[PDB]
C-alpha cells in the first residue's frame, strides 16, 4: 500500500521560488480607442524596492508594459534599460505593501549535475520543466564571449524564458533566455552573478557600458614568462594611440598579469571609459610602460 | 568503490505500474483470406472486470482490436465507446483468472514538480520515460476549455501514448495523450479523476453526453456581487426558451453562486440534457428566477 | 533559510566519470604546408593500456586523430579498427604516467527506471544530459537485430555522442550514440557489456567477425518440443552445404537448445568461421545430425 508513502517531488522549490516569478505583458496601443496584447513572457522580481529581470525581445517597441503577480496584482512598469547582447531588461513597479522576491543565495556555488527547474509564468498555473546544469556559465561581458551562457537540458521555450532557473532549494542559478538560432536538447540561462551586475549597470547607466582596449592577439612549464602576443591593432583605437605595435608582448594590463586572452578581455570590459591604466609590455627584449586611455566598445 | 552502493532509481515505480499498460493493436481485414496491423498504441487496464483505456486514434476504423499483456495473454476487446475531445476510448476484456491492475489513489493530490514517468508498451520491453508535473489540469467536461490536460516535460511519444503516467510510488496520475497540433518539451495527459469520470459515463451512455445552456457571458471588495453577464444568447436555446435576455445578470446556476464563467460552465456540462434547473438573476434591479431546461450540447 | 541546506545534485557521478571522458578530433591535411579540424567528437578511457572507444563516424577518413584530456594532455591516437553496425571505433594511446579510466561495475545489473548521464566533451567544460534508462538493450551481434541498443530520454546529440552514458554512482552503462535517421525524446547508447565485447574483438582481429548459418525460418505448453522451422535455405551456405531442407525443424544448434529464432541467431553469430558444429533436425518424424561449417556473414 503506498497510501502512507510520499511521491519524489520539487514542490518545496517551486513553492519558495514560484511567488516570485511574474506575467509580462507588451501591449500595443492601435489608434482606435483599443489595448492589445503584442507578445507575453515571464519575469523574476529581484528585490523589494520592485526590480524585475525579463527579456528584451519580450519588452521591445511596447507602448505599454503591464506586470501580473500570481497573487492577484497588476502594475503597470517603467522599462529601466536593457541590453541585446544578453537579452536582458530591467523593469521597475511601485508597490505598496511588501512584494514577493526570489530566493538568492550569494555564497552558493553552482554545480554540474545539480537538479534545477526553470519556473515560467507564461498565462497565470504556471509552467515548469526539470533538468539538470549541463555546464556551468562564465560571467563576463566581453562582447565576443561564447561561454557567458549557464547551459541545461530543462526545456526553455516561450512559456519560461524570462523566468527562474532555481535549484531544487528555490535558490535563483540563473535568468532563462530562449535561444533564436546549438546541440539538441540545450537550453540556456544568464548565469545569476552575469544577471545581477547587469542589472546593477543598468540601473546606474540606463546600458551595459563595455570597455574596449583595441587589441586582438593570443597567448604565448612556470619558469617561462606567459602573455598575449599582439597579433594586430586598432587604428585610432587606444593601444594605437597609446603607441602599442604588434609583435608587442603584453605581460601586465591595470596591473594584472595576463596569462590568458579570454580572461583580460573580459577585465579591459569593465573597465569604464575614461579611464587611464598602465599596460606593460616586452618589446626588443626590454620592458615598456603605457598609458592607456580605455574607450567604448564600437556597436 | 561503488560495488556496495545503490544506484538513484524510479524502478520500483515501474514494477509497481507497467504490467498494468497494455499493448493495444488495431487490426484490419483486406479481403485476401489476411490480418495486417493498421496501428499500434498503449492502453491501461483499470479495474478487475476488464476495462481498459486507450487512445480513440489507435482504435479508430479497427475490424479487430487486439489486447497483448506483458505476461503473454492475448485477447479479443470490445469497444465500449470514445470521445473525440479528449481522444480518449474504452475497451472491455473477458479475462479468467486474475488481471494486473493499475494502482490508483483517489487521496492522492497531484503536486506541481512531482516526479512522474510516462509508461508505454509500443512493442511489448516498454517505452518509458522521466519528467516532472508541469501544470495540474481542470477536471472540466466544457468543451470550449483549454485548461482539462495536466502538462508534463516527459516525453510523450507514439511509443507511450495512451499509457500511464504514474508518480514515483506507480500511482497514476494521468493518461497519456500524444499532441497532433504549445511550447516545445511540453507534452500532454488526461488527469487520472477526469479520465475515471469519462470511463463511467462511457460505460452507462456508450458516449460523453454534455449538458449545454446557451449563454456567453463574462463575469462581472466582497460586498459586491459576483456575477456573469450575459452577452449574447443563443437562438432557440434552453436560456432563449426560458427567456433569459441580453445584459441579464446570472447570480445563481441550479443553486451554485456563479462566481466564475468558467466554473459554471464545466458544472452546466455534468447536467443531464432534460433537466429542469432554477436560473437566478438580476434584472432592472429585480430579482428572477427563471426554470430552464437543459439540452445537449451541439456538436 | 536554504543556507543550511545541500542541492539536490548527481555531481557525484560528473567527478567519478568526466575524467576519462575525452575530445576526439579528425584532423585532414590540405596540401598547403596546413592542419584543419574536420569534426570533433568524445571518446571514453577503457583501461590503462590507453584503448578508447568512440564513433566511427567522428573518426571516418582522419588523415590524423588527435585525443585531449580534462587534464590538459593532447596525444596522437592509432585507429584499432570499427565497426559500421554499432557505430564503434577503437583507438589506442601511448601514456607515460596513469591514465584516468571510467569506472566500470560488470557485476551491476542495469534497471529501466535508473537515472542516467550522457555525458560528453565536445570542445572541452563538458556537456552533459541527465533522463533515465527507458528500456534495457539485448547484446546480440546478429546484423538483422534491432533491439541491442539501450534506450534513454537523456539528451544524446553532437555534444556528448561517442562518450559515456552513467548512473548516479559513475559506473558506465553504455556508450552514447547519436541516430542518424523512431520516437521524439529518445536517444541510444550501445550497452557496456555489448561495447566491451565489440573492443576485444577489434583488439584481436582488426574488425568484428560474425558467424553466418544461412538460415531463414520462425519458431513453432512444455509438453510440445520447441523448435525452429526453416523458411528458407540459402544457396551454397553453410545449410545448404550440410544437407538442410526446408520444413526442416531445428531442435538443437551446437548443443543449445533452439527454442528462440532471435537467440539462435545471436548464438551463431559469435561462432567463429571455419568452425564445424552439429545441427540436430527433425524430418520425417525422424531425427538426423548434421555437420555444418559456420562461415562469415555476407556484407
Given at each position: 500500500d503506498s497510501t502512507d508513502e510520499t511521491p519524489a517531488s520539487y514542490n518545496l522549490a517551486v513553492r519558495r521560488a514560484a511567488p516570485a516569478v511574474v506575467n509580462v505583458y507588451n501591449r500595443g496601443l492601435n489608434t482606435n480607442s483599443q489595448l492589445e496584447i503584442r507578445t507575453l513572457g515571464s519575469g523574476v522580481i529581484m528585490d523589494q524596492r520592485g526590480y524585475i529581470i525579463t527579456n528584451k525581445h519580450v519588452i521591445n517597441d511596447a507602448d505599454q508594459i503591464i506586470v501580473a503577480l500570481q497573487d492577484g496584482r497588476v502594475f503597470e512598469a517603467l522599462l529601466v534599460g536593457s541590453d541585446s547582447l544578453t537579452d536582458l531588461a530591467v523593469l521597475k513597479i511601485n508597490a505598496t505593501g511588501g512584494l514577493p522576491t526570489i530566493p538568492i543565495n550569494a555564497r552558493r556555488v553552482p554545480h554540474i549535475g545539480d537538479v534545477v527547474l526553470a519556473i515560467?509564468?507564461?498565462?497565470?498555473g504556471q509552467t515548469i520543466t526539470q533538468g539538470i546544469i549541463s555546464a556551468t556559465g562564465r560571467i563576463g561581458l566581453?562582447?565576443?564571449?561564447?561561454?557567458n551562457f549557464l547551459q541545461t537540458d530543462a526545456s526553455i521555450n516561450h512559456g519560461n524564458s524570462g523566468g527562474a532557473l532555481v535549484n531544487s532549494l528555490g535558490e535563483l542559478m540563473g535568468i532563462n533566455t530562449l535561444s533564436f538560432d546549438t546541440p539538441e536538447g540545450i537550453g540556456f540561462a544568464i548565469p545569476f552573478q552575469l544577471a545581477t551586475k547587469i542589472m546593477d549597470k543598468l540601473i546606474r547607466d540606463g546600458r551595459v557600458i563595455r570597455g574596449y582596449i583595441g587589441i586582438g592577439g593570443r597567448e604565448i612549464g612556470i619558469d617561462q614568462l606567459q602573455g598575449i602576443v599582439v597579433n594586430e591593432v586598432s587604428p585610432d583605437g587606444p593601444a594605437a594611440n597609446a603607441g602599442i605595435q604588434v609583435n608587442d608582448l603584453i605581460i601586465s594590463v591595470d596591473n594584472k598579469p595576463a596569462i590568458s586572452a579570454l580572461e583580460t578581455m573580459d577585465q579591459v570590459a569593465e573597465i569604464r571609459p575614461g579611464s587611464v591604466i598602465p599596460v606593460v609590455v616586452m618589446r626588443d627584449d626590454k620592458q615598456l610602460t603605457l598609458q592607456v586611455t580605455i574607450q567604448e566598445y564600437p556597436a
Open positions: 515560467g509564468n507564461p498565462y497565470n566581453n562582447p565576443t564571449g561564447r561561454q
